[PDB]
Amino acid sequence: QTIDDSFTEGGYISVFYQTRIVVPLSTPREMDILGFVSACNDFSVRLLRDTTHIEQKA
Amino acid sequence: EACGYSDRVLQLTLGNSTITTQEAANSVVAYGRWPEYLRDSEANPVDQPTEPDVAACRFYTLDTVSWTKESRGWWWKLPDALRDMGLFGQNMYYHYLGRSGYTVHVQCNASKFHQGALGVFAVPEMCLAGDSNTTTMHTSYQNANPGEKGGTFTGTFTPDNNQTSPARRFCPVDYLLGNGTLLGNAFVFPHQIINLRTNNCATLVLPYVNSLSIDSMVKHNNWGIAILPLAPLNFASESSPEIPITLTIAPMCCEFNGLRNITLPRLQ
Amino acid sequence: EACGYSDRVLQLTLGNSTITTQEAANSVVAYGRWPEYLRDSEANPVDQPTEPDVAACRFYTLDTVSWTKESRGWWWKLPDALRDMGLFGQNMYYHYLGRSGYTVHVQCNASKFHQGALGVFAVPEMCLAGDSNTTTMHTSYQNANPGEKGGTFTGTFTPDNNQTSPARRFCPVDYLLGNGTLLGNAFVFPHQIINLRTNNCATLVLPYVNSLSIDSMVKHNNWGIAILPLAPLNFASESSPEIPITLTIAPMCCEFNGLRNITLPRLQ
Amino acid sequence: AATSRDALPNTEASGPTHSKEIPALTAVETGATNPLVPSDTVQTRHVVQHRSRSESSIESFFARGACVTIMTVDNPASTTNKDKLFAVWKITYKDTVQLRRKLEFFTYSRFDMELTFVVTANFTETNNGHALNQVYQIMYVPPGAPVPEKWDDYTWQTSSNPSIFYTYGTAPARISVPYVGISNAYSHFYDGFSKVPLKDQSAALGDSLYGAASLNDFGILAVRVVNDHNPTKVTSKIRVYLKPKHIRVWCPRPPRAVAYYGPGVDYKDGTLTPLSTKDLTTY
Amino acid sequence: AATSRDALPNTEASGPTHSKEIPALTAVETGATNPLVPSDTVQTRHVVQHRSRSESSIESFFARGACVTIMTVDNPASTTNKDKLFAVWKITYKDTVQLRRKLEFFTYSRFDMELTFVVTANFTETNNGHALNQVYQIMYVPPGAPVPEKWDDYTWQTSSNPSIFYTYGTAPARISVPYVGISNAYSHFYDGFSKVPLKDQSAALGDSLYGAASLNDFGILAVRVVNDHNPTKVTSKIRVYLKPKHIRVWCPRPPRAVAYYGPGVDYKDGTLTPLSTKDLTTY
Amino acid sequence: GAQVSSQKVGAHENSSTINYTTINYYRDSASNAASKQDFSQDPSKFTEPIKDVLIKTAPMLN
Amino acid sequence: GAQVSSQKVGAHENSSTINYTTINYYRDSASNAASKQDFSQDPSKFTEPIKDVLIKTAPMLN
Ligand SMILES: CCCCCCCCCCCCC/C=C/[C@@H](O)[C@@H](N)CO
Ligand SMILES: CCCCCCCCCCCCC/C=C/[C@@H](O)[C@@H](N)CO
């Protein structure tokens, strides 16, 4: 279900330090990592419906 | 090639101009469509078209901008940005109608000790949001078209309050792609990422895109070139580093119709 | 491959776990023998064996240890080290007999400005020397088997003097491979060297080795994983540098016999 | 050859791997998305796939009647001093948000348009008098044609313009319209202007709205109650349902993330913070 | 090959018997039922059987429109202080008993659903004013979609959701719905929970209803009167008839013997004595 | 696309098989009416679920 | 002029492909209903718009 539901729950996605980010001198000890999500060719959706991500109060 | 050839090292040649690069992340061809001339089956204007070829279909280098910890992003519009570029701008202004593709080459080098990621995006019909909350679609022709120097994005939306004498210009907020939609999704659009640790630049080959076979290049801008810092510039320990972002662009398979006297726009 | 492929870049996949590496010095297969199930011609225990497959034959990551100028070396024993690892440890304890191969992946990255060489060795029947000079072969089951956290080597042999209440544990001296023989020769054993300037890690594929077709995994440890600093850790100028050594291991073609009630060992 | 309703690709049985091949590793910088599948990073079993993308196809996604406007007309008592109220609506999909946001997932579009009209009426005054069954006249006035100024002037003759004479209480009115654009495809977005500001010519003259093409894209819908003034006043409402059929779309875009503010892409202060608070390390 | 409407097996002529064969004798302990027939225990004549099980087939047994709910909506006078009453019903076959008991003769089920809507209206006040013919809007709101808060808020646009615009006095509305279950078959019974109570985690958190799966199985039916507030108040009722077509059923069960008590199998004190008094030796 | 079938005829008039014609108007199976052309099956899986097939003339328990 | 097609059948009754008949009453294509008989295409032009075709098993950057 396209909503928060105990019965149809997907599980947990977590990230960790296997070893540790190592850098030499004269270099920034802090950096940013960007993350992207997309669907595999086995992916599909059904039961067309109106979304809550947009509205017209008035 | 066991012979030497590689994805990172390219050589682009158009007319009398040639671009070389030893650190590229391959190249992108918008919607898998390589620029092309207007076909007879799809043609509209009946008059013999003007095809400048090498005189206009070459590489023009715009004014180099500076990337810093503070930078929120930069934007340009085509053909607007090339309007004053040699024979291409001349032919664009002398004709009622005109169509053109582009080879966009964004240059930005640094060092193995620098950090940062430039999100380079090619957006069809890149309509931007205005600076007014009392009125709409009010951004003036002069302000909507910065020419070669282009415009820039803001981390914050600050409404034009001078009702009497309106700034009549754009207020493009970075995280909203300057147009009411979330930046994180800008990737559905033809693009490339300039990740300092991986590559010097971004090469995008753009086709002529539009609801019409050919249109008014002076009244209408087909493509929008948006460059935003996905990951902020950062160096060794310097609190205020800096690196240049040079933008070189070349018109392609471009052609023009409806020839008459030169168009002298009110650009100020 | 002119297509791209290379010795330094590998991708290992077992069950639901996958390991990637861009800086490897190839991989080693102990005695040229790839792990395999017990053949009918060589089989002993007549009962239908238990083959956990993907549930146990996957990658378990043990507790990450710290490498420093002071470190004399680290040691582990198989299967002992994996005894508490998910479904593999469960099946090992529920059965009288068990046999298993391993894919040992030692991870240790740094920087082009760091120095040092980790000697990673896979030793069959790695019997270690005790801490006592008044008695012999006295090292207790609890101390001989540290489990996941493993043990460590000492630059000096210091005898347990408490005759009344003996420490009853090992005193493995580095230069003597913890067992009465010269370290310089440990290389006759299946191994790889983690030389900071050349590679991030060491991958050793170990086969089931032993005087018997299948044995008691709880009473007996088939392989010993010894990691010693051939060349001491060193960085730029820092007087006390540090880098992590993470050890990830995966059981292979593993199978079990003589099923009964779970074995609850006196590990303390 | 691949049909929108064909079963998606079957998951193939995949075993262990110790090779120089690195599917999991890549470089998003190139502008491309890693074509990976479960069997590339983990040990998979063989699965015969029955699932389909039938309902997510362009036609299927829009194959639904959506409300684009509510027109208000009326029929007062002859005596009243105020004029008989007849409706004039400038045709468009932007007066409402739902359908507009969906169409806007894309830059250009092409399609035959199906307009369905739901008409509801009611009494306004604590009166008691009644009214005979009303007959509505929905006239389509294309750009250039004489726009009606009175609920009963000469224009309602519709000699050339298309008019729908709807009878109250009967099945909601419905008509189909071809791809009528003066362009090879509808433009959900126009990054330019209808005019070119010429130096040599007075500022105010060369001026025009940003992102706005034909001042009058598709003309207007002029609705009225054909019946003569009735002693007892009756107010009616015409709900217009728009459905895009035989549709095609080009150049995808990121959905509208913040409250619509006018016919253009303009956003308004106080509505720019869509996303809610949620910690980096909290499930 | 045997059709639901094929004539049952003919009774064969059977004479006297003095043999070692014992059909009449058996052992129910094995879990099986003695396949006996009249000719096995008595002398029978030859009879050509014409009777059929046509009407007792799964489809035939349920091939009937059954009332699952009665929705109440209304349209008051603009002035009234109280809100225009629009209905919101959570779709299900358990609000009523008849159809539920029939479906429950089985553990699992599968079928295309046919929903028929009977709409009746009436006047509430000893008034005398009238009201123009009403037009109802039956909107289907699937789990996740913006549920309506006002008889006239933005949600009624139904850009994506399926809506039925019914006109009073006209043939009762009707629509068909496929097998929409997220499972390979509808579960008349779920011997478990939607959540797993984890020690390491606070009691109240891991808690959930017994026998209850998806908190929101199939969304809801949102009904309203499209017509604007009318001086004279008119109350309407929407009766929903549910018919299971193209149906399949698995694992049979003993019919509900005692009064239903909620959506689950729960029984209530004072209702546990169905059977009546009747003596062992009395005809 | 017309589907012609046979009506199992009950009470015949003083008036050879009789038929009825059916045609599907919609693209979705769900929209379709009930054929009623259904099949019977042998109760075995419920009346005799036992491992060892049983012969009625012989002793159930042996 | 009747156009006969196949219904992709979902939940089948205890009752071979099933069909539905369609006929166009109007002269103008616009008047016609939606076939829903639509085609899928490979995302390539958007997920992999790169000049040099990419092989997933090999290094994206080489
Ligand atoms: C009696 C009823 C006659 C109905 C006549 C309707 C004809 C007009 C239909 C115009 C269709 C406009 C659809 C939306 C187009 C917009 O997206 C444009 N701004 C884009 O090009
Ligand atoms: C405009 C009207 C649209 C009507 C939309 C109806 C769609 C929802 C139908 C859900 C069918 C539910 C049938 C009963 C299922 C229950 O037995 C479940 N608890 C069992 O899985």
Curated annotation (Swiss-Prot), chains D, E:
Highest taxon of source: Viruses
Residue ranges of the region described as Disordered: 1-21
Segments crossing the lipid bilayer: none
SS bond partners: none
Annotated localization: Virion; Host cytoplasm
Oligomer status and interactors: Interacts with capsid protein VP0, and capsid protein VP3 to form heterotrimeric protomers. Five protomers subsequently associate to form pentamers which serve as building blocks for the capsid. Interacts with capsid protein VP2, capsid protein VP3 and capsid protein VP4 following cleavage of capsid protein VP0. Interacts with human PVR.
Job description of the protein: Forms an icosahedral capsid of pseudo T=3 symmetry with capsid proteins VP2 and VP3. The capsid is 300 Angstroms in diameter, composed of 60 copies of each capsid protein and enclosing the viral positive strand RNA genome. Capsid protein VP1 mainly forms the vertices of the capsid. Capsid protein VP1 interacts with host cell receptor PVR to provide virion attachment to target host epithelial cells.
Name listed for the protein in its UniProt record: Capsid protein VP1
Organism whose genome encodes this protein: Poliovirus type 1 (strain Mahoney)
